């Protein structure tokens, strides 16, 4: 069928936890093949390698090419443009992308286990909610004590758009299931959220047994010398 | 392109609420068609009036109506289709699922960091541990059901265990702080196949997250 | 005394569990010739099937038929008609029924357990109360935790009419007794109420061991 061309921003985990930041420019809907080429406006090292094509719906050619080393121009607010010409269309196509403006930072919340899970004494679950952030890219990582847990032990959903009270914002959730003996020893668990709009690119919250559905509040205030010639 | 057919279970929103439960046998082809179910059941099917998709095969489908009871009784349905552009007549079949499990529903109180801004408070509903992945989530305020455009539910993913295969889902609802202060109640209902009464409900209000007792001691010495 | 004809309405249990529906049209009063054939105004393919002439006392052998498949036109608001022909009645008569209108949503309350029997520590009584619904049809079931109890552990009264301002509503009650051991431990219980004026066909209220907060403030000099 008829072709199309798009442009994709770099992935979030490589801009936060990494060094390299590859853009990409793809070309789908091509009939058989091409000996095509691309165009990038900053080209101080633009080894735009292509690689092999893939096979798409019913039979289609889909080839693409990436551009390495573009982290600090992306963070400074620059602009990138891709444009390709090929046999199987009349005119060259074009596309552009830029770093987003007018963003918001998330509100992170970590919730204690429900009351009826603590009685059966087998496993408990903790919930991590992030809310109200403007681009839809986000990461979630869990810790036990001060050591990171492996990725295959929890479940994270996707970022979706919430009902509107003004500006459009997003939200995401996650749950982690831990042993009910570690909750009663006094171990602490922590939830980390990384986003484009946060100051140092990560923030965290922490919870344990004494903080959350506490059923007891103990506080003792001692004031030593209230009548004591304050100079 | 390529020819391919499938069957589809009836939708849960009509198996649970009001019994008009259809059963659809679709097919992608014409690179006139027939269908035949193994229960004849008197009332014949309809042939789909043949939308095409994605520059490819002009797809046609068929719908057998009235399958609310024998789906629940445990029968088997098969659909066999035929087209001139096919070598042999194709087939598939579908039944009701075995070894099901019922979900555990929890409604969580809002976080303490949020009530100090006087804007809106958020409530969180969680359903966990059910084996067939079809489920419904609805919210209420008192007795009035809220419209669908007022809240947000996610998809029903598969949770990481090793015993068997179970699933989970979440949902949030943001209500006004003045209604939370006034003492109104909000509910979360969940519909599933494996529940004996098809629904279960949890309720919450501004109390019952409040602590049991507080001990303060000031020592002026 | 006269051989009378009547018409019923479908039972709320299977109408709310969704799988089928019935509608029965009765003639009794005299043991006559069993030429009792019955005429229904609509027929959704499968017509009426009369059973046996079911026996009764002192010659009052009844004759009555029932057609199946009356979920969708009954819920939409159709108007059904029944008439019979058996030789004693030479001039039979019309029987029209209709889904009721102007319904009210009920109010359900669960009351905690009087401390007079809580002092004795043998058993406690829980009371579920419904009030303010327009037709005289309910379903009351009890649960514990997330498991449903069998129907022989509790009793339930019938639906009386309350006298109040202007219009006519109704009320039901029931009573459950449970061991004080796990109730002291903290096991939770719940009461469900089924009605056709509710949007999702059910409501549910739970209860658990309403206490306020204790506050201890001490100053030491
Ligand atoms: C980016 O592309 C859009 C077309 O989607 C165009 O309207 C806009 O002017 C372009 N901006 C730049 C800076 O090229
Ligand atoms: C029916 O479906 C089962 C699996 O769902 C399949 O193994 C079988 O071949 C099908 N056909 C029959 C029983 O004719």
Curated annotation (Swiss-Prot), chain A:
Residues 3-98, 106-208 form the Ig-like domain. The keyword Ion transport does not apply. Residues 1-231 are extracellular. Keywords: Adaptive immunity, Cell membrane, Disulfide bond, Glycoprotein, Immunity, Immunoglobulin, Immunoglobulin domain, Membrane, Repeat, Secreted, Transmembrane, Transmembrane helix. It is a single-pass type I membrane protein. Its main location: membrane. One of its GO terms (biological process) is glomerular filtration. It is found in: Cell membrane. It comes from the Eukaryota. The keyword Secreted applies. Immunoglobulins are composed of two identical heavy chains and two identical light chains; disulfide-linked. Monomeric or polymeric. Part of the secretory IgA (sIgA) complex that consists of two, four or five IgA monomers, and two additional non-Ig polypeptides, namely the JCHAIN and the secretory component (the proteolytic product of PIGR). This is Immunoglobulin heavy constant alpha 2. The gene is IGHA2. The chain holds residues 110 to 325 of 391 of the full protein.
Swiss-Prot record, chain B:
GO terms for cellular component: blood microparticle; extracellular exosome; extracellular region; extracellular space; IgA immunoglobulin complex; immunoglobulin complex, circulating; monomeric IgA immunoglobulin complex; plasma membrane. GO terms for molecular function: antigen binding. Changing residue 184 to D: In IMGT allele IGHA2*01. The keyword rRNA processing does not apply. The keyword Lipid metabolism does not apply. Keywords: Adaptive immunity, Cell membrane, Disulfide bond, Glycoprotein, Immunity, Immunoglobulin, Immunoglobulin domain, Membrane, Repeat, Secreted, Transmembrane, Transmembrane helix. It is a single-pass type I membrane protein. Residues 3-95, 103-205 form the Ig-like domain. It is found in: Cell membrane. Glycans are attached at residues 22, 93. Signal peptide: none annotated. Immunoglobulins are composed of two identical heavy chains and two identical light chains; disulfide-linked. Monomeric or polymeric. Part of the secretory IgA (sIgA) complex that consists of two, four or five IgA monomers, and two additional non-Ig polypeptides, namely the JCHAIN and the secretory component (the proteolytic product of PIGR). Constant region of immunoglobulin heavy chains. Immunoglobulins, also known as antibodies, are membrane-bound or secreted glycoproteins produced by B lymphocytes. In the recognition phase of humoral immunity, the membrane-bound immunoglobulins serve as receptors which, upon binding of a specific antigen, trigger the clonal expansion and differentiation of B lymphocytes into immunoglobulins-secreting plasma cells. Secreted immunoglobulins mediate the effector phase of humoral immunity, which results in the elimination of bound antigens. This is Immunoglobulin heavy constant alpha 2. It comes from Homo sapiens (Human).
């Amino acid at each position: 069928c008829h072709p199309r061309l798009s442009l994709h921003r770099p992935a979030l985990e490589d801009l936060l936890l990494g060094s390299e930041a590859n853009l990409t420019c793809t070309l789908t809907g091509l009939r058989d093949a091409s000996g095509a080429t691309f165009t990038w406006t900053p080209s101080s090292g633009k080894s735009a390698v292509q690689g092999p094509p893939e096979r798409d719906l019913c039979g289609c050619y889909s080839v693409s090419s990436v551009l390495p080393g573009c982290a600090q121009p992306w963070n400074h607010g620059e602009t990138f443009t891709c444009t390709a010409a090929h046999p199987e269309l009349k005119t060259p196509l074009t596309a552009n992308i830029t770093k987003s403006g007018n963003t918001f930072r998330p509100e992170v919340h970590l919730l204690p286990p429900p009351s009826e899970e603590l009685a059966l004494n087998e496993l408990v679950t903790l919930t991590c909610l992030a809310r109200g952030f403007s681009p839809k890219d986000v990461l979630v990582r869990w810790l036990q004590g001060s050591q990171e847990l492996p990725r295959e032990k929890y479940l994270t959903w996707a970022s979706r758009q919430e009902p509107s009270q003004g500006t459009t914002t997003y939200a995401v959730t996650s749950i982690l299931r831990v042993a009910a003996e570690d909750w009663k020893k006094g171990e602490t668990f922590s939830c980390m959220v990384g986003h484009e709009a946060l100051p140092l690119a990560f923030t965290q919250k922490t919870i344990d047994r004494l903080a959350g559905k506490p059923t007891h509040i103990n506080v003792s205030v001692v004031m030593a010398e209230a009548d004591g010639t304050c100079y």
